[PDB]
Design an enzyme around this catalytic site. Structure first.
Site, PDB file in Angstrom:
ATOM      1  N   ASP A 501       0.832  -1.162  -0.051  1.00 15.27           N
ATOM      2  CA  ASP A 501      -0.054   0.101  -0.026  1.00 15.27           C
ATOM      3  C   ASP A 501       0.897   1.350  -0.091  1.00 15.27           C
ATOM      4  O   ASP A 501       1.732   1.608   0.742  1.00 15.27           O
ATOM      5  CB  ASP A 501      -1.042   0.070   1.093  1.00 15.27           C
ATOM      6  CG  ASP A 501      -1.868   1.237   1.110  1.00 15.27           C
ATOM      7  OD1 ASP A 501      -2.659   1.467   0.586  1.00 15.27           O
ATOM      8  OD2 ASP A 501      -1.476   2.210   2.148  1.00 15.27           O
ATOM      9  N   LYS A 577      -2.689  13.478  10.909  1.00 17.09           N
ATOM     10  CA  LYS A 577      -2.747  12.769   9.638  1.00 17.09           C
ATOM     11  C   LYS A 577      -3.982  13.028   8.662  1.00 17.09           C
ATOM     12  O   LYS A 577      -3.693  13.445   7.398  1.00 17.09           O
ATOM     13  CB  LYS A 577      -2.913  11.214   9.930  1.00 17.09           C
ATOM     14  CG  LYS A 577      -4.076  10.309  10.103  1.00 17.09           C
ATOM     15  CD  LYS A 577      -4.427  10.118   8.683  1.00 17.09           C
ATOM     16  CE  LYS A 577      -5.661   9.465   8.434  1.00 17.09           C
ATOM     17  NZ  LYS A 577      -5.686   7.965   8.929  1.00 17.09           N
ATOM     18  N   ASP A 758      -5.531   2.312  -3.159  1.00 19.89           N
ATOM     19  CA  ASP A 758      -4.147   2.691  -3.257  1.00 19.89           C
ATOM     20  C   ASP A 758      -3.296   1.518  -2.738  1.00 19.89           C
ATOM     21  O   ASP A 758      -2.340   1.779  -2.259  1.00 19.89           O
ATOM     22  CB  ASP A 758      -3.970   4.078  -2.831  1.00 19.89           C
ATOM     23  CG  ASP A 758      -4.236   4.263  -1.208  1.00 19.89           C
ATOM     24  OD1 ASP A 758      -3.495   5.111  -0.672  1.00 19.89           O
ATOM     25  OD2 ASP A 758      -4.896   3.520  -0.792  1.00 19.89           O
TER      26      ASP A 758
HETATM   27  N1  LIG Z   1     -11.167  11.437   3.894  1.00 17.35           N
HETATM   28  C1  LIG Z   1     -10.590  11.349   2.541  1.00 17.35           C
HETATM   29  N2  LIG Z   1     -10.875  12.447   1.780  1.00 17.35           N
HETATM   30  C2  LIG Z   1     -10.426  12.358   0.683  1.00 17.35           C
HETATM   31  N3  LIG Z   1      -9.938  11.296   0.035  1.00 17.35           N
HETATM   32  C3  LIG Z   1      -9.613  10.274   0.681  1.00 17.35           C
HETATM   33  C4  LIG Z   1     -10.057  10.174   2.048  1.00 17.35           C
HETATM   34  N4  LIG Z   1      -9.542   8.963   2.957  1.00 17.35           N
HETATM   35  C5  LIG Z   1      -8.878   8.444   1.699  1.00 17.35           C
HETATM   36  N5  LIG Z   1      -8.777   9.182   0.779  1.00 17.35           N
HETATM   37  C6  LIG Z   1      -7.871   8.464  -0.303  1.00 17.35           C
HETATM   38  O1  LIG Z   1      -7.831   7.133  -0.201  1.00 17.35           O
HETATM   39  C7  LIG Z   1      -6.459   6.667  -0.077  1.00 17.35           C
HETATM   40  C8  LIG Z   1      -6.463   5.610   0.881  1.00 17.35           C
HETATM   41  O2  LIG Z   1      -6.752   5.883   2.218  1.00 17.35           O
HETATM   42  P1  LIG Z   1      -5.851   5.889   3.496  1.00 17.35           P
HETATM   43  O3  LIG Z   1      -5.162   4.475   3.443  1.00 17.35           O
HETATM   44  O4  LIG Z   1      -6.805   6.178   4.687  1.00 17.35           O
HETATM   45  C9  LIG Z   1      -4.442   6.978   3.330  1.00 17.35           C
HETATM   46  P2  LIG Z   1      -2.873   6.758   3.883  1.00 17.35           P
HETATM   47  O5  LIG Z   1      -2.727   8.049   3.051  1.00 17.35           O
HETATM   48  O6  LIG Z   1      -2.352   5.436   3.323  1.00 17.35           O
HETATM   49  O7  LIG Z   1      -2.482   6.937   5.385  1.00 17.35           O
HETATM   50  P3  LIG Z   1      -1.858   5.974   6.479  1.00 17.35           P
HETATM   51  O8  LIG Z   1      -0.670   6.274   6.499  1.00 17.35           O
HETATM   52  O9  LIG Z   1      -2.827   6.615   7.882  1.00 17.35           O
HETATM   53  O10 LIG Z   1      -2.306   4.616   6.205  1.00 17.35           O
HETATM   54  C10 LIG Z   1      -5.882   7.808   0.119  1.00 17.35           C
HETATM   55  O11 LIG Z   1      -4.302   7.890   0.084  1.00 17.35           O
HETATM   56  C11 LIG Z   1      -6.477   8.980  -0.382  1.00 17.35           C
HETATM   57  O12 LIG Z   1      -5.994   9.212  -1.772  1.00 17.35           O
HETATM   58 MG   LIG Z   2      -4.463   2.410   2.029  1.00 16.94          MG
HETATM   59 MG   LIG Z   3      -2.441   4.246   1.625  1.00 14.72          MG
END
Ligand SMILES: Nc1ncnc2c1ncn2[C@@H]1O[C@H](COP(=O)(O)CP(=O)(O)OP(=O)(O)O)[C@@H](O)[C@H]1O
Ligand SMILES: [Mg+2]
Ligand SMILES: [Mg+2]
Length: 829
Positions: A501, A577, A758
């Site tokens: 990821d 975050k 992602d």
């Molecule tokens: N609240 C939100 N608003 C807008 N886009 C969001 C979002 N949550 C997630 N996304 C999108 O979804 C993807 C996957 O979400 P996450 O895994 O929660 C993020 P991450 O950036 O890998 O953080 P982490 O280091 O806390 O795991 C993000 O990288 C982002 O592009």
């Molecule tokens: Mg993710």
């Molecule tokens: Mg991620």
DNA sequence: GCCGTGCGCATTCGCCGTGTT
DNA sequence: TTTACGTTGCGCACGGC
RNA sequence: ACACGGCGA
């Protein structure tokens, strides 16, 4: 394996997968449809046996048709009561108060509510009901009106919170307590209300003809057509919301905007893009996008299977009084004990609402898992949301929470291997939390814990700990396979999806199309010693601020002490975050206050672990500003690129009219763009066509526009600008996700994929290649085309002139060497 | 039509459930 | 028919200069 | 399509 000819199901499935599986599949789709209507009925009943039929969509098609006629008979009565040279019925008195809209609605509404609830529907009861209904408004919008915005801030922000038509009529008594200027309210008396309803009962008969009066004091009924209709509309609705379940055979390949996923050819087939308007979907009717159709297809042909060993644990361990996995919802309430004691034990209520509701899906997921255990394999149909992101169709899927993903493993595994083994230790280190340190220190974590792992693997029941890791069930899932490797060696067939990821794909994507090296640096887009954690970077920065007391800390009339409260809480990457990844998406400082307050404080409050903030507000507003300062000085190009997208949305959304004779020279219009893999996106939000009008208690209802104007629906120039940035990059990663699935498959022969936007996953033996596939795609994509320049060219010559040219220039490119991503160990996605 | 008093909107998307005590 | 401490800076509008 | 709780990103 299927070409344009498969038109008659069962025959195609059976002579392809055996009629034994063909039947099961079809049996299932049909059940999904069955459980759907079941779930519908159950509800359409709880609302019926709760006087809320007006709320069910089955009545709306009728209400809309009788609402205008009423108000069209209500007014006519008035003017006519004016022609009368004398006295006026008490009805005109206790009815001129509230809006002629509420009147009619509260009429039709209430008239159906208590004439579908009980069987004592008499003029005296219904009218008395409408009377208390009409009075429970009687234009006492003392706050809603009279220019008393106190409602749209401290009186509305709550009513929309309080659940139940009982607590809204009760909690509203609260607001009323306080003087609020004016005062006193003459009760309509239990004798005028009935009459108020009487007239209302009429006019409805005079216009809609809905209700009818028997001749058995008089009972109220419903016309054989205006009764059969809501029961007809029901049956309709009932079968258009199926509880989709996975497949027992590969999903039906997509060959058009509709008909993919499931095989049963029903009246409501599956659509490739989860659009809102049929018009929006037909927009794909003829778009040529082969690579898109391939990602979706390939990805849905991934055969999954229930992880029996992980199921065994989960099944029993989730019943447990005290589960060792502080994440799972208990079976029972939160007691009640612990302004009066209740002051602290107030959250108990809402906190249990989260539990019982979180408990429902948990049980549904466990229902599906056990239901599908034993099957040699299962698949999930896939489609997209409209920005192009891929989603599994069924409620149960490889995209669900921890337990969910833990309950699922790829069906086609292979001997793990040296690398496959390596990549698994990494996986396990990740499932455990050990993921923000270089790869070598992770293997060390797994190896230096060899025994704990075997233990949990031998008696997961007896030996928890795996349940004390961030990803308990997934980690557990790994412990099992790890033990298998020990007992069998590198030739061990392993199918455990190893998840790769990306780290903040948001900024990564922005950093990519801008060649932003600083940003890319932060989000691991270049080879590096240790893994860069942009959230940690912002976390450390905030800290320096907090650490500073005097230079940033003031006296309380204050900071200082405020910072101390946080320093005490120990601010880490956990906080800030969400604030860090949404900045480039449009989130502002006010957004952070809410976020940090709701993501960190609110949860830390009702728990005890965080009861030193003395009022969350200000304590959250405080953090909100440090996060801003700290983040604003970190994410730069991104923001610049964001504002560039907002200008294009703003400009295109705008409606330019000539300065001297303002005819509309250019009409508002959607922002359009094509993702690198050929996936077209159409962002055209719309301002609600039928203006809505609340009633505090009875609910909310729309109504055909007064001014004959609503040709298209009116584009929402506001949403169009606030969404453009987030929607754009999302469609950039979705394309990147799709580009990688196709790339990994055709260049590396990968068949199994665990996709989560992602997050990219496969079986251990193919992890090495997915590790390269993703990256190779990241690179080739942003190196072959300029997504922002291509976007410009998309609206530039097209609808955009007529003065419009305040369009900020495309951001200057950075010095980042995209090809480096190939050498980046922490990039992943 | 230059720069003043003011109501509104806080990032986006996907989707399930109960509406109570 | 008895759980719910409370909050703040850019922008497009209808407008008298 | 606007509201509450949750899950997902
Ligand atoms: N609240 C939100 N608003 C807008 N886009 C969001 C979002 N949550 C997630 N996304 C999108 O979804 C993807 C996957 O979400 P996450 O895994 O929660 C993020 P991450 O950036 O890998 O953080 P982490 O280091 O806390 O795991 C993000 O990288 C982002 O592009
Ligand atoms: Mg993710
Ligand atoms: Mg991620």
């Amino acid at each position: 394996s299927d070409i344009e000819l498969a038109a008659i199901p069962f025959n195609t499935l059976a002579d392809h997968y055996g009629e034994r599986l063909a039947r099961e599949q079809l049996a299932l789709e049909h059940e999904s449809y069955e459980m759907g209507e079941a779930r519908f009925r159950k509800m359409f009943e709880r609302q019926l046996k709760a006087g809320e039929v007006a709320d069910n969509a089955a009545a709306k098609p009728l209400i809309t048709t009788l609402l205008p006629k009423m108000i069209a008979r209500i007014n006519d009565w008035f003017e006519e009561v004016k022609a009368k040279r004398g006295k006026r019925p008490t009805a005109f008195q206790f009815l001129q108060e509230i809006k002629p809209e509420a009147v009619a609605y509260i009429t039709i509404k209430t008239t159906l509510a208590c004439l579908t609830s009980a069987d004592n529907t008499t003029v005296q009861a219904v009218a008395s009901a409408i009377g208390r209904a009409i009075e429970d408004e009687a234009r006492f919008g003392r706050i809603r009106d009279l220019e008393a915005k106190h409602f749209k801030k401290n009186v509305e922000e709550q009513l929309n919170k309080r659940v139940g038509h009982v607590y809204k009529k009760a909690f509203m008594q609260v607001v009323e307590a306080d003087m609020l200027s004016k005062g006193a309210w003459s009760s309509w008396h239990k004798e005028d209300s009935i009459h108020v309803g009487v007239r209302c009962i009429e006019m409805l008969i005079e216009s809609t003809g809905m209700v009818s009066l028997h001749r058995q004091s008089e009972t109220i009924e419903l016309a054989p057509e205006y009764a059969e209709a809501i029961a007809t509309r029901a049956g309709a609705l009932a079968g258009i919301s199926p509880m989709f379940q996975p497949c027992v055979v590969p999903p039906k390949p997509w060959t058009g905007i509709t008909g993919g996923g499931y095989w049963a050819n029903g009246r409501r087939p599956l659509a490739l893009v989860r659009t809102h308007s049929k018009k929006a979907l037909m927009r794909y009717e003829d778009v040529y996008m082969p690579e898109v159709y391939k990602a979706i297809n390939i990805a849905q042909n991934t055969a999954w299977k229930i992880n029996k060993k992980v199921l065994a644990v989960a099944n029993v361990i989730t019943k447990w009084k005290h589960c060792p996995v502080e994440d799972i919802p208990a079976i029972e309430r939160e007691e009640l004990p612990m302004t009066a004691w209740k002051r602290a034990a107030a959250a108990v209520y809402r906190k249990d609402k989260a539990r019982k509701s979180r408990r429902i899906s948990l049980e549904f997921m466990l229902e599906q898992a056990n239901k599908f255990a034993n099957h040699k394999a299962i698949w999930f149909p896939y489609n997209m949301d409209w920005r192009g992101r891929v989603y599994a169709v069924s409620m149960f899927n490889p995209q669900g929470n921890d337990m969910t993903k833990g309950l699922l493993t790829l069906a086609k595994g292979k001997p793990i291997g040296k690398e496959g083994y390596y990549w698994l230790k990494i996986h396990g280190a990740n499932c455990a939390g050990v993921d923000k340190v270089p790869f070598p220190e992770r293997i060390k974590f797994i190896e230096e814990n060899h025994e704990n792992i075997m233990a949990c693997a031998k008696s997961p029941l007896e030996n928890t700990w795996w349940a004390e890791q961030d990803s308990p069930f997934c980690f557990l899932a790994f412990c099992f396979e790890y033990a298998g490797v020990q007992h069998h060696g590198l030739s061990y067939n392993c199918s455990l999806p190893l998840a790769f990821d990306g780290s903040c794909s948001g900024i990564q994507h922005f950093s990519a199309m801008l060649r932003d090296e600083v940003g890319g640096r932060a989000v691991n887009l270049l080879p590096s010693e240790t893994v860069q954690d942009i959230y940690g970077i912002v976390a450390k920065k905030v800290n320096e601020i907090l650490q500073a007391d005097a230079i940033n800390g003031t006296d309380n009339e204050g900071t200082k002490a405020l910072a101390g409260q946080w320093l005490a809480y120990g601010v880490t990457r956990s906080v800030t975050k969400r604030s860090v990844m949404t900045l480039a998406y449009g989130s502002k400082e006010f957004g952070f206050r809410q976020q940090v307050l709701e993501d960190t404080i609110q949860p830390a409050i009702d728990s005890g672990k965080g009861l030193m903030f003395t009022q969350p507000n200000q304590a959250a507003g405080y953090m909100a500003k440090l996060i801003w300062e700290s983040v604003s000085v970190t994410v730069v190009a991104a923001v610049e690129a964001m504002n560039w997208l907002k200008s294009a949305a703003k400009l295109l959304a705008a409606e330019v009219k000539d300065k001297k004779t303002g005819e509309i020279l250019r009409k508002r219009c959607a922002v359009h763009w094509v993702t690198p893999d050929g996936f077209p996106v159409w962002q055209e939000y719309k301002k609600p066509i039928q203006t809505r009008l609340n009633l505090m208690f009875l609910g909310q209802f729309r109504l055909q526009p007064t001014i004959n104007t609503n040709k298209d629906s009116e584009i929402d120039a506001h949403k169009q600008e606030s969404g453009i940035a987030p929607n754009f990059v999302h469609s950039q990663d979705g394309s990147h996700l799709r580009k990688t699935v196709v790339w990994a498959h055709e260049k590396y022969g990968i068949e199994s994929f665990a996709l989560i936007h992602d997050s990219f996953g496969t079986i251990p033996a193919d992890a090495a290649n997915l590790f390269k596939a993703v990256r190779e795609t990241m690179v080739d994509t942003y190196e072959s085309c300029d997504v922002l320049a291509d976007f410009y060219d998309q609206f530039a010559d097209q609808l955009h002139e007529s003065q419009l040219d305040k369009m900020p220039a495309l951001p200057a490119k950075g010095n980042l060497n995209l090809r480096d991503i190939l050498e980046s160990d922490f990039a992943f996605a």
